[PDB]
Design a protein around this ligand. Structure first.
Ligand SMILES: [Mg+2]
Ligand SMILES: [Mg+2]
Ligand SMILES: [Mg+2]
Ligand SMILES: [Mg+2]
Ligand SMILES: [Mg+2]
Ligand SMILES: [Mg+2]
Ligand SMILES: [Mg+2]
Ligand SMILES: [Mg+2]
Ligand SMILES: [Mg+2]
Ligand SMILES: [Mg+2]
Lengths: 98, 127, 79, 114, 206, 96, 151
RNA sequence: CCGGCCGGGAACUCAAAGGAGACUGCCAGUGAUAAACUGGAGGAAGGUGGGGAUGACGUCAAGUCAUCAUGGCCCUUACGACCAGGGCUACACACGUGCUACAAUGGCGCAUACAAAGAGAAGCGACCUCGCGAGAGCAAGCGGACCUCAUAAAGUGCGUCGUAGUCCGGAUUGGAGUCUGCAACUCGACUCCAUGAAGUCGGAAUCGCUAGUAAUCGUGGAUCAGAAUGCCACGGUGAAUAC
């Protein structure tokens, strides 16, 4: 009935707002169709490393982005007060609707 | 019960289901032929039934995605010897000697900056 | 060869050609607009087309129409 | 088997043979074996003269051969006369269409010498 | 010129990141610069506040801004004043609103940047570059540091012809990724040139 | 990299939305199968630097017009100078 | 091979006859990594050789091959200034690693319309050792044995 | 509705977090009873498994004052600033790097199987309709394991071509267009119709690569309004050889 999409660049973390959200649900109202992993899109930025000439040099950086699903089936006006006001985690992104 | 073996090889991954029956072979809802029995290595999908017999004894409906013509026929070949799991481990020794048991871990090697392609090095002249 | 749906020309050039037609041709006629597609309403006039250092005179004629002004004013001097 | 041009082709598959003409290049060919209603992989063996002159009229439709060469040469001469860039280039024997001349212009420049 | 930046190659492990926030392309742009703008303004301001490292995070439509210093009471001012005049214009710059956190720097002789800055600050005060390096190094082995090294670079003292001259005491495995290594950077804009400092401080493993 | 050359690029973004995007949209539909009263295009007499395709794309900090990236809005030089101090979230030297 | 001596990868004894020997043949003739279309030409040329010799397949290849095999070969050797072509009795495993290499090489250098054709005629010339490749056996023995001296 | 499509199903594929596993440790041969190597076992992986990241003190007053910073130096109603047009695209030549070929291991027509990895709201753009086409109009889904880019090509089939400067090769040029963008003359990219150079495998000389590599086949991306044979990434098929 309500799923919350989750994304951040750090993994040893996103699954900590995951297992916090999930937890702050089953204990309260409950239900939650477990936390789903879901394709972690990894951008790759590769650029020349010398201030001038040397096209063979270059650094190869990346940005891993991680997803987590959530899915809570039983929206208990209590678990609604359990998502809200029991949250935070600055570097994570939450999407309530779809 | 469905007695299973996975198997996979370079980008492909095939799942092989066993069940004593006939000598018929399903894959991606296809005949052995209608998929690639009539291309390079039809014989190799059947291969995992050499020192271990069939000719019409045991059935095998399977699927497989990813990779290509011979990666998929490698994946499946692995899955068959993997399914021969259930039929004891007595048979899974001349399946070793066969080589069919091993996971062919050979992967496409990356294209690495500075080069043309993995190893291929930009021809150079000194002057 | 481009343009497709509405051939192009600079306004200042086009209204520099009516400042002649209804008024009679003056001396050569200066534009830098080497882009402008030549029009029938320019034939017989002389447009001075910039090429870098100066403007080359070009008598427009019954077949320089579709072409541009820059086409008749070489820019790279090679001897 | 003559047809349209001074050209007297034939003796292999049709569509292919037709290309011989200076003015038909595969598409104008397919379009004529179709606009004359004839088999297109057929030689001239079995191919009646009766059919040949039907095609001869179809090709008559377009500016092929001699006329084409002249028209095509007139087009280039017009260029030069106008004293424009695409022409100034035709008279100087160099690439019309912008191609670099600092190197590899050869084709439109004649084998290199000094 | 062929060493991998020590901090950078750590990140994944043992080293943090001075921005944690997340954003998605569209704003990743305007965000990155905003960050620069704050670290810019704040470093010119808290110049003589011995600030060692400024962290930024934007939690939904907000910007936090943490400030590691070795003179908190200078950054903070009279019972909270300076923090305001900052916070104020720090939120002004980023547009979105802004708290601000003053983390205290324990044992600054261990903080690379704060080492470098000193050596710098001194060279401009005009002091013997050899001495300062050597002082620096000790005050660190003094307070634990299982290794350290500083090098300077060019017109050292005056020399028309430029030098470097480092100074390693202890252990400094810029190859062991586990190794906690605090590496930073400070330039000194002298009357005769621009001298660049690199300090490595080895702190342990795991 | 030369204030003046920077400045240029700012007025360019300024006008780029004053007229174009806005008043220039009158050319998208003002030039579609709506036939003609040729005043239609003629109106492209506006500031020149009002067009967006005129905007270069310069390293947000240094102005360098080459080696730029839309992600970080920086030249590959600065991108790395920051990348190695964290500075860019999530971004790190990668392999695979 | 400065120090790191090696063994020799082994390939998959041929998808029709069950021979490793041919499997190397096909590879040899193969190009741009087209196994799909490699044996295709080898079997068809072994098919023209099949009945155009009758003799069969296995044994017709064996003989035609049997000819282009070299027994000895010279090996460069830059000593006191000079290059010194030194003869050496060459091993079985390679003895036909060439034979095949030359047989394949001989057929591409040939007039026939197709590869099945070209290859076929080479095997056949060799059968009665009178082809391009068998000549490469002749000129190889002729090269050594002139260096008969050095040994 | 024979569409994972609907119920469901939690097995499997995968997804991404966390785990175990490989240590010359096990038998044996070699070697000083050592180090190690060699072979065998089991095992997905045997001898740092495969690949990457990591580049010591130092050498070339090696490269960068034009990324930025900066000592000194010089211009300052000009060495600064603004605008149009041109130029960086010139063309007797030479050298480097590459792309495309010379063809039947191919060209061509039609049918047809199997990838990976990315990309996206001032975006990816379906569907439909129009146009031979490039494209266009209209319009859905998609911030995206959902939607779009997007029908992988080598391959396999039949058939045709039959060794010819050719049904190989596609330069060059004429003609007519399409899209982007104030603007395609200089100089954009694509398209349709014609056009059809050189080129039949390359002297002296020289380069790459030791395995999922070379060779070959397509796929995406950064830059980017538009502009890739370059660059950076992806998988398909898949060798030869080392005394
Ligand atoms: Mg590959
Ligand atoms: Mg050349
Ligand atoms: Mg400046
Ligand atoms: Mg631009
Ligand atoms: Mg220099
Ligand atoms: Mg300066
Ligand atoms: Mg330039
Ligand atoms: Mg052709
Ligand atoms: Mg060739
Ligand atoms: Mg090697």
């Amino acid at each position: 009935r309500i799923r919350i999409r989750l994304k951040a660049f750090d993994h040893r973390l996103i699954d900590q707002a995951t297992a916090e959200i999930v937890e702050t649900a089953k204990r309260t109202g409950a239900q939650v169709r477990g936390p789903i992993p879901l394709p972690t899109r990894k951008e790759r930025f590769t650029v020349l490393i010398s201030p001038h000439v040397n096209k063979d040099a270059r650094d190869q950086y990346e940005i891993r982005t991680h997803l987590r699903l959530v899915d809570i089936v039983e929206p208990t006006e209590k678990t609604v007060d359990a998502l809200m006001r029991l949250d935070l985690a600055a570097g994570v992104d939450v999407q309530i609707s779809l | 019960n469905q007695y299973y073996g996975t198997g996979r090889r370079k980008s492909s991954a095939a799942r092989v289901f066993i069940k004593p029956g006939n000598g018929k072979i399903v894959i991606n809802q296809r005949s052995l032929e209608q998929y690639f029995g009539r291309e390079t290595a039809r014989m190799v999908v059947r291969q995992p039934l050499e020192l271990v017999d069939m000719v019409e004894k045991l059935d095998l409906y399977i699927t497989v995605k990813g990779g290509g013509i011979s990666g998929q026929a490698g994946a499946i070949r692995h899955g068959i010897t993997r399914a021969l799991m259930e039929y004891d481990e007595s048979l899974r020794s001349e399946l070793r000697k066969a080589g069919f048991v091993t996971r062919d871990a050979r992967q496409v090697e990356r294209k690495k900056v500075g080069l043309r392609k993995a190893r291929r090095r930009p021809q150079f002249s000194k002057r | 060869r481009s343009l497709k749906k509405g051939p192009f020309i600079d306004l200042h050039l086009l209204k520099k050609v009516e400042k002649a037609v209804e008024s009679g041709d003056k001396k050569p006629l200066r534009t830098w607009s080497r882009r402008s597609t030549i029009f029938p309403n320019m034939i017989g006039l002389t447009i001075a087309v910039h090429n870098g250092r100066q403007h080359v005179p070009v008598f427009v004629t019954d077949e320089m129409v579709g072409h541009k002004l820059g086409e008749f004013a070489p820019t790279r001097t090679y001897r | 088997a003559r047809i349209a041009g001074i050209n007297i082709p034939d003796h292999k598959h049709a569509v292919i043979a037709l290309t011989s003409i200076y003015g038909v290049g595969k598409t104008r060919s397919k379009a004529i074996l179709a606009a004359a209603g004839i088999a297109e992989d057929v030689k001239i063996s079995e191919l009646s003269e009766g059919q040949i002159d039907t095609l001869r009229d179809e090709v008559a439709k377009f500016v092929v051969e001699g006329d084409l060469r002249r028209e095509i040469s007139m087009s280039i001469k017009r260029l030069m006369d106008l004293g424009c860039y695409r022409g100034l280039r035709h008279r100087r024997g160099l690439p019309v269409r912008g191609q670099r001349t600092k190197t590899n212009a050869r084709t439109r420049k004649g084998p290199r010498k000094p | 010129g062929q060493k991998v930046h020590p901090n950078g190659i750590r990140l994944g492990i043992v080293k943090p990141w001075n921005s944690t926030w997340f954003a998605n392309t569209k704003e990743f742009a305007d965000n990155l610069d905003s960050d620069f703008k704050v670290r810019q303004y704040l470093t010119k301001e808290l110049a003589k506040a011995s600030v060692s490292r400024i962290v930024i995070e934007r939690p939904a439509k907000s910007i936090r801004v943490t400030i590691h210093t070795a003179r908190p009471g200078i950054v903070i001012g009279k019972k909270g004043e300076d923090v305001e005049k900052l916070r104020k214009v720090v939120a002004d710059i980023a547009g979105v609103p802004a708290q601000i956190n003053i983390a205290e720097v324990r044992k600054p002789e261990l903080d690379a940047k704060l080492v470098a800055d000193s050596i710098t600050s001194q060279l401009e005060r005009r002091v013997m570059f050899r001495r300062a390096m050597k002082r620096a190094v000790q005050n660190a082995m003094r307070l634990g540091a299982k290794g350290i090294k500083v090098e300077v670079s060019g017109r050292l003292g005056g020399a028309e012809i430029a030098r470097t001259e480092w100074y390693r005491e202890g252990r400094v495995p810029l190859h062991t990724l586990r190794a906690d290594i605090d590496y930073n950077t400070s330039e000194a804009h002298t009357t005769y040139g621009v001298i660049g400092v690199k300090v490595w401080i080895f702190k342990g493993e795991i | 990299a030369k204030q003046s050359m920077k400045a240029r690029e700012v007025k360019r973004v300024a006008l780029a939305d004053k007229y174009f995007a806005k008043r220039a949209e009158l050319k998208a539909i003002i030039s579609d199968v709506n036939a003609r009263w040729n005043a239609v295009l003629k109106l492209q007499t506006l500031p020149r630097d009002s067009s967006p395709s005129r905007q270069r794309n310069r390293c947000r900090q240094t102005g360098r017009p080459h080696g730029f990236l839309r992600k970080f809005g920086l030249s590959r030089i600065k991108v790395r100078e920051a990348a190695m101090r964290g500075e860019i979230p999530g971004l790190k030297k990668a392999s695979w | 091979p400065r120090r790191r001596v090696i063994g020799q990868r082994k390939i998959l004894p041929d998808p029709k006859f069950g021979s490793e020997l041919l499997a190397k043949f096909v590879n040899i003739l193969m190009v741009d990594g087209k196994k799909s279309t490699a044996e295709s030409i080898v079997y068809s040329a072994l098919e023209t050789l099949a009945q155009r010799s009758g003799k069969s397949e296995l044994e017709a290849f064996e003989v035609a091959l049997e000819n282009v095999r070299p027994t000895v070969e010279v090996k460069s050797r830059r000593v006191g200034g000079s290059t010194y072509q030194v003869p050496v009795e060459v091993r079985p495993v390679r003895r036909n690693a060439l034979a095949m290499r030359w047989i394949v090489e001989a057929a591409r250098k040939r007039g026939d319309k197709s590869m099945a054709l070209r290859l076929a005629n080479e095997l056949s010339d060799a059968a009665e050792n009178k082809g391009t490749a068998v000549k490469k056996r002749e000129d190889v023995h002729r090269m050594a044995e002139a260096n008969k001296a050095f040994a």
